[PDB]
Ligand binder design. Sequence first.
Ligand code: HEM
Ligand code: HEM
Ligand SMILES: O=[N+]([O-])c1ccc2[nH]ncc2c1
Ligand SMILES: O=[N+]([O-])c1ccc2[nH]ncc2c1
Ligand SMILES: [Zn+2]
Lengths: 400, 400
Amino acid sequence: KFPRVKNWEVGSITYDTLSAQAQQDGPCTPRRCLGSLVFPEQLLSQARDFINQYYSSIKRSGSQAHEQRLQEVEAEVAATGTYQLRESELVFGAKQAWRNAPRCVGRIQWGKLQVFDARDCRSAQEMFTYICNHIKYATNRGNLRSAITVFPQRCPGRGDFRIWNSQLVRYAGYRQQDGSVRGDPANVEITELCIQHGWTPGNGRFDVLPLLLQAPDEPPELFLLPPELVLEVPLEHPTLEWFAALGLRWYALPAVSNMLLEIGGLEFPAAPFSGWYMSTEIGTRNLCDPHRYNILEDVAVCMDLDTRTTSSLWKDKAAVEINVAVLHSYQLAKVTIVDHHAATASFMKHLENEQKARGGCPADWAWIVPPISGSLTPVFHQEMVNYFLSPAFRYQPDPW
Amino acid sequence: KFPRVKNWEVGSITYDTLSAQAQQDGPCTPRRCLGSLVFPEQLLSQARDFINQYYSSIKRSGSQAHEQRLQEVEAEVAATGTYQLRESELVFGAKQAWRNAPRCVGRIQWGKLQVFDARDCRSAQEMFTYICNHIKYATNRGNLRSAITVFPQRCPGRGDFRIWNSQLVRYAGYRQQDGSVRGDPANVEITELCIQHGWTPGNGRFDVLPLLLQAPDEPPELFLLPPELVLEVPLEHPTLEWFAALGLRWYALPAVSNMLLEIGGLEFPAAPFSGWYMSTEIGTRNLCDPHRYNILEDVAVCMDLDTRTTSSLWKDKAAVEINVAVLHSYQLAKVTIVDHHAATASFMKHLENEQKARGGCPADWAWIVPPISGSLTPVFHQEMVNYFLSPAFRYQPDPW
Ligand code: HEM
Ligand code: HEM
Ligand SMILES: O=[N+]([O-])c1ccc2[nH]ncc2c1
Ligand SMILES: O=[N+]([O-])c1ccc2[nH]ncc2c1
Ligand SMILES: [Zn+2]
């Protein structure tokens, strides 16, 4: 009854006993697999399970304190339809959410997460202050530290706190008259929203977007991150001298801000989190995706490669050097970064740790395997089981 | 409801309506996805469906001929417990089996498959002759032609025709006394079986294995493939002059021979098929997999790369040149080969053709996306739906 999981490189076998405890249902059915696709009593049920997880984590399950807590949660929901998490439970829940994220390859670090409690936040201005403090702590002058800031939970009588931006730091995307885009094409919508809301735009390829912050039942407010808080890295190549002349750069801090944090049935629509970059996301996805900066052809031409035929593998060669540049540049500027080989190796260790700890680990193979050199990394040869566990980070509709 | 399928590079959307016709069930459930895992009345229902597919294909569904055929099959099953396919149906069925294979990126050529009827095969010796003929026809001195040879179907009260080898052409794998393996580690088991049956083993890294052919209720017979029949390609690099000295080589013809062909409830345990190679399978998987030839480090050392740290991307760089070597060598030897960029590009066209033809296309994302430079290809950005349609090629247990 338990899924057999095999590693085809070494031949080792394991059984996922944790999958049987999946709290929610995925998109797949026996008739067809949809794994490649990107996207009252129910509250109490999830609440009780979470409390059980918490007390089990501190080795006090079945204790008087455990039973008391279960009764309090039940009492609060009966009277208000919701409940208040204790500080220690929020911290525990935030870590479990990261731990449970199937698409995250950096989970070996799940236990080291700084949790900022912003549940007392009352306005967009205070939300901005909290965000700036998160960025400063997380950036730590280049020695990045994982962190999450949790804003007030969704509740019955009012709207939600929301960060409109997809990440705390993103580059603007300006649609040009000729039909092209200057900057990040992925950010055209949010850029136009900022402009619509009062922001006079810049005209560069790497303009840091302002934050569009939303307090309950109020229109979003624009806030500009002090440049001194946004650490960036100029891109250069160790041997290709002309690379530095391209004027490319990227930001140090990858901070997702559009996901919803779910803990024991409670929902936190605004809870930005951050870690550090795995080089392929910048070097391969952000810079080489055809619908992103799309610099592959230009770099190849500068490398004097034959772009006439696909068989010369000019695309592969250019992509590799761009990734080399990203890694070399971050190391030079002393900003935390991890290559795909080192990251996937650490994930294999994580799988081992979790097998012993909980008898399995929800993992999304398509997202775990890096965008380049897939089969050269250990995770490629590792079968995985994908399932939804709670606490969890979930996608949610854009506020507009 | 029909699954909504999106391409994230372009933004186009389609609905897979074909998946509702999935005759068999997969390993996934709403509880968990297992997409990354490698592995009388019922006969009539499958037979009728297939016959219906056949008459629909020639635009004569509902005809007297269609009805007479359905009745003919029913009568044959009532009298013998099984039935026989007409030659035209066999051809159609084999082509559909390829068309329906979710893990095959080369399906745009499905309609051009050349099907050879070997159902009159009486012995292992006749089987060998059929196999040699297939090899000569398919290899065609380098100008490869897709083809399949179908041997007698499985029937009650009689053993099965089986080809013990996984492919018609495989390199021996010799386990050395010191624990290492000389040759292809993937072929250790079959090599030892060939030795046990009377084969005099060689001692090279690229020794073409003999065929272990099984006739109904007979022990497997050993057969040596005439060397002039096995076209091979010596590997060299266009700029790295020392690459040729490594003495690497690979065969021209990729001919899978251990899969079972299922058509309308009938099973053909022996039905070897072949096409032509996509470069990454040789350059990345066969030569660079840790559990295969594992030549990555040796090549990186010869390239004078810093193998001390992972961040220099020495593995990625070596892997790219190995793939360049494969492509260059096959093109030089004038043997059909397709790079991963051209292959994935053609698959996107195949998906387009299929959407219009059948309203969908069963595809396994994890297998369609190449082992290197995934995101650099269009298929990476394409959501897919995986399901089992029949006719089909299925895995089957080893005869031993
Ligand atoms: C510490 C370093 C970390 C590394 C190297 C890492 C790396 C990654 C990578 C490679 C992905 C896929 C990114 C993409 O394709 O967009 C990812 C996804 C994800 N990560 Fe991690 N991560 C780290 C920290 C964190 C932290 C601190 C959290 C949460 C507290 C987290 C939560 C997630 C989630 C929820 C996803 C899925 C995002 C989605 O579905 O779009 N990660 N991470
Ligand atoms: C014409 C050129 C062809 C190309 C470039 C091609 C390419 C591929 C590739 C890259 C794979 C997956 C990787 C692997 O082999 O392990 C594959 C799998 C497969 N191909 Fe194709 N193929 C071709 C022709 C054919 C033909 C003629 C048939 C059958 C009539 C076929 C049947 C299959 C099947 C059933 C699989 C799944 C194999 C498995 O599960 O291990 N292919 N092919
Ligand atoms: O999702 N994330 O927060 C996240 C964290 C770290 C990362 N490195 N590279 C991509 C990436 C994404
Ligand atoms: O399935 N096949 O016969 C087949 C055909 C062509 C191929 N290229 N690379 C792998 C591969 C497999
Ligand atoms: Zn699935």
